[model samples]
Target: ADGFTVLSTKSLFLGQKLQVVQADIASIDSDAVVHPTNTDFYIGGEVGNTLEKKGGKEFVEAVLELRKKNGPLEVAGAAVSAGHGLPAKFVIHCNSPVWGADKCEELLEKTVKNCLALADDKKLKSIAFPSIGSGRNGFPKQTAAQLILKAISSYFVSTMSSSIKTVYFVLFDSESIGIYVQEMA
Candidate 1:
């Protein structure tokens, strides 16, 4: 396991928690791990590729099956699948919007909200998210973190009994960690 501890934690409301960490999300155990995907649900990109490697053959097969069954998701849609070989029990794959595109802020927020909705649907207690869209999708660090936290905070407010107890921002970069940790304070 990557030797990293939670760097920050803040309460959104009630017993819900938002945490920041510098770690590889695939190696971080949680009820579910969030993955950014394309409209066609293609598992391409550095984040996707690394998880795909660690998640092994079953994970790859499941993704292919998902593509066959559900095909493309809406620009901001999210879905859940078994984590297979990964440490997490489930994977929440979301179609993130391009940074400079029109309505990106709204789309990204919806993407995060949709991921949480799926976690609740599965009755998951913990969820892990990476610095989605910031790597290849070109989202500004501050904008991505703000929108993600906003979605989670509002989600916690609206659904107090949401099965989600812990929200982990398992960031891969120092920049993302700094931003998320700053938000906590």
Candidate 2:
């Protein structure tokens, strides 16, 4: 049921038509993948932990190298590049806020904005996103998806050139996907 787009379903996820593939973070061959990162952009929890487990410590090592060059990213900050032998060509490390803080809303929006903007800048055809700030960050799932979906929808709409095409909300769990489904339903 999950496909790229439905000829009829505009303004929605179109999973029903698109061959939407589901896999762990280590899987997938999309143009780019998101890393649920801390403010410092360290890959150390659920998403990060799984990716490193699959892709190996070198994956974490690659981010560290980039971090050395671009140390201490601000909350919602992002940097893009090939991540040490990770399957995808490029990895975008996004620093989402540590959930439930007074500034969480701003941080979530800003993080999504920055990550999508980076994808646009890189001229990506497709990119997959793990709901930013969800897992360890503890931000509300549906609320966070709404902000991210809004940001991505707006980014695609506002841009004159469609350099970036596909944007997937690659959820790790059915619960996460359920929340996202409401937005696209």
Candidate 3:
């Protein structure tokens, strides 16, 4: 198999397609890429580290400016910023949920929801996301996939006039690619 393969693609409202791909988000160009961050919205977590490494100095500055204007985000809260040097033009940063909390399921759902809403609000036509909370944050992989994918499905259906027409679930590992493919099917 070649690198950055799309394991599955599910078409949604209009001509929108939700895809599960095995690749680092860095390899794919989109209007926006979703970054999971802690509520502090600093260069923390797996995604944040990568973002800082590739997104140039101004990416962090954009993050800081937004945080100063809006303060720290609550769990599942999301915001947007310029991608700076990233392949994607914009980064939609969502405060991902840790799985132990009682409201983790709902929080994760809201996280995906708000991320999608933020992208649509900006009239971005495409976006990408990782399987938030399933890596270091400890959500079960299957649970994370199910909730996040379902949220995407529901959001696309609910917002018929949304500007976003393409969504990608970019998985770094095969297990996640398989899980999301199965769930999307």
Candidate 4:
């Protein structure tokens, strides 16, 4: 085991579960993992790099193929690709915006919504997400967690028949874990 701590768990939509956990996103045993990505899907951000390193060249190629077919991704949009060597079956890459003076929070929230929508469309049963825009994008950790949870809560409430039954907010560090735990509470 990788020392994951399940900070909180809640039931949603009758049978669905939401978990806030401190763990490696790459190791999450879910149907998919959300990568807080750039428009270019650059494997340089904190979450992106770890995903690429764990998923290997096949994962990179899969993302590249997706990019080739879709052209450039729009901000706050998401694209799905094969997870390859990762623990999950799909990788949901989302264009999380870099923090700007204005509308950055809205953009990050929109990105989270997009990823959740993509997973629902694919009929995925479970997925894990990181603190999108909190690291390289300069968004505050607590704020990011709040926005992400808000989006997830909204999605589950709005989509009654969603196949996604489990959602994991997987954080890598103690501070983020504590923030997510407090927010989930």
Candidate 5:
């Protein structure tokens, strides 16, 4: 099993062979980066903490400013503007729906749509997304991956936006990356 590999294809529009890479999300260089935010937009834990730490206090301040401008965003909601003093031009925040009765498919779809919309509106060519709701929020990796891919593929097929092209799921772990890769395939 060590040397074994698997691959597949699913059409999001013109059809694409799904790719999965395991790496630190913070190190990713893309046109935009997605932040896993809470209702408060605080990057205070896990992936959020890591990004804030690496990106520095200024990054956090920028995020705080974004929040000051748009505080208390609804859970499973998303907003895109500037990345404070960070490298990218925009930072898209997706508040994963809290796990429980509120965790509806509608929220997931809305979250993805909102994030993608921000990219589309900004005319961004590439963006990176974490496995929303799949970490501390307890969203199942495989299921969440399928849902995310579904959202992106749906948008690509229906809207025909030429401004944005690449969407990377910047997962940290091999298991999470594998789940997303399978869905992409």
Candidate 6:
């Protein structure tokens, strides 16, 4: 079996912790999970599609409704919606730019940071994230892992929040997990 690791760092908020897990993100029960999304707001990729399926059509419709109301999201922007059938109470739709379509590192960092902020805004205690922009978006896994970890680390260091006690990066594969383990170290 591929190994998993956890890295922790101090946050401005007392007792806040950051964690990494090699598992299916949808299965983790947290207050929220970050859904790496396109600006179009459809659940097109593997992680997003799986979430829409597990969270039921209601989740899909809710997203569609939001898009219909507010228009498409800008890359690096985010929106939150009910989790529906999923375990988490909220789903944070973070628009990670298509790899090579923009400044990959910048947009990816914003995507991760925005999700964390959105979770904190809702007073969520824990949140999970997948490898944003890496799957169908064609981002290099190692680079994506590096950017994600850097963003999370910076967020906790720079921001103070009472609600977000734990953030989990739940990677689905061995290579990404290994990359994150290394980057986090």
Off by over 4 Å in 4: 181-185
| TM match of model 2 to true structure | 0.82
Decide which is better by lDDT, 2 or 4: 4
Residue 73, model 3: lDDT of 86
Error of 2 at 2 (Å): 15
lDDT of 3 by residue, 52-171 (tens): 777768778978887888788887988988888788888888888898987999999999999998998899989998889887789988888888888998887756689888899878
Q: In lDDT terms, how accurate is model 4? A: 0.84
Among all windows of 10 consecutive residues in model 2, the one with the lowest summed lDDT is: 1-10
- Model 4 lDDT per residue over 1-185, tens place: 25688888888766689898888888887998998777787878898888877888988898898888988899899999988888889999998888774688888878887888899899999999998888888888888888888888877775677888899988896778677566546
Cα displacement (angstroms), candidate 4, residue 36, comes to: 1.1
Each prediction's Cα RMSD?
1.6, 4.4, 2.2, 1.7, 4.2, 3.0
The better-scoring model by lDDT among 1 and 3 is 1
Q: What is the C-alpha lDDT of each candidate?
A: 0.84, 0.69, 0.83, 0.84, 0.69, 0.78
Lowest summed lDDT window (length 10), candidate 4: 176-185
For candidate 2, the per-residue lDDT at 148 reads: 72
Off by over 4 Å in 6: 1-14, 181-185
Could you give candidate 6's per-residue lDDT for residues 88-160 as a string of tens digits? 7888888877888857779899889888888878888998888888898889988887788778878887465
What does candidate 1 score on TM? 0.93
TM-score to true structure, per model: 0.93, 0.82, 0.90, 0.93, 0.83, 0.86
lDDT: worst 10-residue window of model 1: 176-185
Task: Single out the weakest 10-residue window by summed lDDT for candidate 5.
Answer: 1-10
Instruction: Indicate whether candidate 1 or candidate 5 has the larger lDDT.
Output: 1
Q: What does candidate 1's lDDT look like per residue over 54-145, in tens digits?
A: 88788898777777888788888888888888989988899988989999998888889899999999999999988778888999988888
Task: For residue 137, give model 1's deviation from the true position in Å.
Answer: 0.4
Residue pairs in collision within model 3: none
